[PDB]
Design a protein around this ligand. Structure first.
Ligand SMILES: Cc1ncc(COP(=O)(O)O)c(C=O)c1O
Ligand SMILES: Cc1ncc(COP(=O)(O)O)c(C=O)c1O
Ligand SMILES: [Cl-]
Ligand SMILES: [Cl-]
Lengths: 427, 427
């Protein structure tokens, strides 16, 4: 940490940081690093969708997609994602424009009705319900459990998955633990992909709750930043082999493949779980939007069509991620106050600044017109116990804007560090 | 009832009915009068949607509809339905492809969280919850309350609304009554449209539950079978004037305007109710499909565009409804065993055959290859206490198929009547 600088040298460095920050403030910036959404250039890749499906409104089975019926979604589109996810067509359904809505409804159904093999609806559990939450994690997962009054237990992330030793120890003895949130490939925002061994342990471990569920939110399933695709671990297959076929609920989406908010969602599970979901989903809706599923089927053609499309996204995104890392390295590496992820896929870089300074860094950035994700955002209840983590979303801005924004962020992180050491430390 | 026929004459008539039925059976029919969905010819009216929105993916406000954001739906599309429904844009949101899903989620939110001004979540009411259900009514409404364990109280339908005297008497003294299902224009399947006076009474009546709600499912809001449109009663305005602004929840849909399952839904309410819904809907989804809302906005143009489109539907549908009535009249009127609605809009005709024979009539039809809606389908718990009601859906089949199907249905209804009088009555 500022290795071998004396207090006098640190005070001189702090003055340089203040001057960098004054200059930054003079530029009157209006930049934003918070939006985990595709750029306009990425969305342009899918503009053919805007004139699809055209005159032929029938799918390959002859179904008139313009009329009512069919809860499972179009088999032809499901076959594409069955190949990508390694889940058979009967074990996969296609929904409307939101995978979050599938996860949410599953939690709501679990509360009101219980899961397919629950002893009772979760709302009838007088001692409450808990979910395990690997951190840093996805704030919209946490929002679902928080709103339903489900207690969240944060779990440390390690190199090839969460802390599975700890998870096993907790779930074995606490029947209130009903679920775990995961993003098992390129996690938001850790960038961590769960190893085969991690997945095997999670589907085999003994749980005090007979109806424990892994919410396997494979949001980034094909979302590589390199020219290679990750191998999908067969979580449903491994779970069935362990005698826990109902344990995993698998989700996926085309929001960051085609149009964000105009895509198609997917839910995968055991046949029993598919039937359970559809029994209650059938009370909610006659069924999903088949015309939008058809447009996607026509656009993609097959699984290789999706893969090639992802490589086109990769060509736009990879330079943005490379840029963020390069700027952070060049500005922060020598000070040793920070560390950051170097993800091989997904939509985020996770930055840790000097512990005790993340909130301050965000406030400094806000005052020079750079929006940076709120401190604590990737934690349940927004509680980052070390006040160090900042999520960075590189996807949306132009390269020149991203460069300025991250360089500004670095200036703020450095100033927050020297300010705190000198003014609080050497008070 | 078979006026002035002697027992010998009735037995001879019964023999003629058996011969008509034998002949019907010989035709080896495969017909269906159960599907409340638009015909292919109606759906063809909206085929321009299949190539929309085209290159311009921006709405009039400049919003890129292909990207995330915006929970309320596109203001331009909401402005069209604001005019049609008589509800201001800020009081109306546009969703995805299902109005049922809006109603369902509202009931689920009410259970888990309570409504905006509830004393507690409805799930915490130890003595249970009840909804009033005007009958005959919409089976998918009843499916929502049944699945949530909400007791249903059936209420007789009268000429210009339900039995409001009875509703007022019950809601005043039972704090467990939290809601009422309605279809207030061209009801499914009564065809009844609630008068202004009926609506005024429903929004003014005292309720023991301070958070009582009218589920105002205006599914058939513009769905005329004549060249005239019904006047929309201002239920939200009247409710606000009575000091019960939060009482009505208004729903509408384009499923029977454009594509059934590929349309846009709407929810309208007080500003407080809109904010309440969106607070919990925001935990479920980042927001609705704006691209599909844009296609609809481009297609319709304005409220008069929707109206003209409905008159194009009316030209297809009205002859089908006229045909059903003519066949029933010609075959059944003299026997006086039956009565049926003559709706001025909506998607159904409600037929009452001889009480005690509806199940038998349906079974007879099934055995000659004519699918007719299950007896009891328009009642909570599928309980028609008079075993008389049969819902007829005229919209889907071709004219020649409809003619054959309804004429067959009449033959079955007549045979069920004579069979029952002779074999059970004169046993
Ligand atoms: C982990 C994760 N799941 C789900 C989603 C949202 O996808 P959808 O648009 O299908 O809700 C996101 C980002 O949108 C995400 O990061
Ligand atoms: C009364 C009523 N409400 C709602 C609906 C369904 O509309 P949506 O497709 O918007 O769920 C129907 C028929 O579909 C209906 O008859
Ligand atoms: Cl997560
Ligand atoms: Cl109803």
């Amino acid at each position: 940490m500022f290795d071998s600088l004396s207090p006098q040298e640190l005070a001189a460095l702090h003055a340089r940081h203040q001057q960098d920050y004054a200059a930054l403030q003079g530029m009157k910036l209006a930049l934003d690093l918070t939006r985990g959404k595709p750029s306009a250039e990425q969305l342009d890749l899918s503009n053919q969708l805007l004139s699809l499906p055209g005159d032929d409104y029938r799918d390959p089975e002859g179904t008139d997609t313009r009329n009512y019926g069919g809860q499972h979604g179009l088999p032809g589109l499901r076959a594409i994602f069955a190949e990508l996810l390694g889940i058979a067509v009967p074990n996969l359904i296609a929904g409307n424009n939101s995978s979050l809505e599938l996860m949410h409804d599953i939690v709501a159904f679990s509360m009101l009705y219980g899961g397919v093999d629950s002893p009772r609806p979760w709302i009838q559990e007088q001692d409450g319900i808990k979910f395990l939450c690997p951190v840093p994690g996805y704030d919209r997962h946490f929002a679902i459990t928080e709103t339903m009054g489900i207690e969240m237990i944060p779990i440390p992330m390690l190199q090839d998955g969460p802390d599975v030793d700890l998870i096993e120890e907790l779930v074995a003895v606490d029947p209130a633990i009903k679920g775990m949130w995961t993003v098992p490939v390129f996690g938001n925002p850790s960038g961590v992909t769960y190893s085969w061994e991690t997945v095997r342990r999670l589907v085999q471990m003994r749980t005090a709750a007979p109806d424990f569920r892994l919410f396997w939110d494979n949001a980034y399933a094909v979302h590589t930043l390199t020219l290679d695709f990750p191998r999908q671990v067969d979580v449903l297959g491994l779970a069935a082999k362990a005698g826990n076929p109902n344990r995993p609920y698998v989700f996926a989406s085309t929001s960051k493949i085609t149009f964000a908010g105009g895509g198609v969602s997917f839910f995968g599970g055991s046949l029993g779980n598919i039937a359970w979901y559809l029994q209650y989903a059938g009370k909610k809706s006659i069924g999903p939007d088949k015309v939008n599923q058809l447009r996607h089927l026509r656009f993609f053609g097959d699984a290789d069509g999706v893969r090639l499309h992802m490589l086109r996204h990769q060509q736009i995104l990879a330079p943005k991620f490379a840029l963020v890392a390069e700027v952070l390295d060049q500005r922060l590496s020598e000070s040793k106050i920070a560390s950051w992820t170097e993800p091989k896929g997904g939509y985020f870089i996770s930055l840790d600044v000097l512990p005790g300074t993340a909130r301050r860094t965000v406030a400094l950035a806000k005052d020079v017109g750079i929006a940076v994700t709120e401190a604590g955002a990737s934690f349940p209840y927004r509680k980052d116990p070390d006040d160090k983590n900042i999520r960075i979303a590189p996807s949306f801005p132009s390269v020149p804007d991203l460069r300025n924004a991250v360089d500004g962020l670095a200036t703020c992180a450095l100033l927050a560090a020297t300010e705190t050491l000198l003014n609080q430390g050497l008070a």
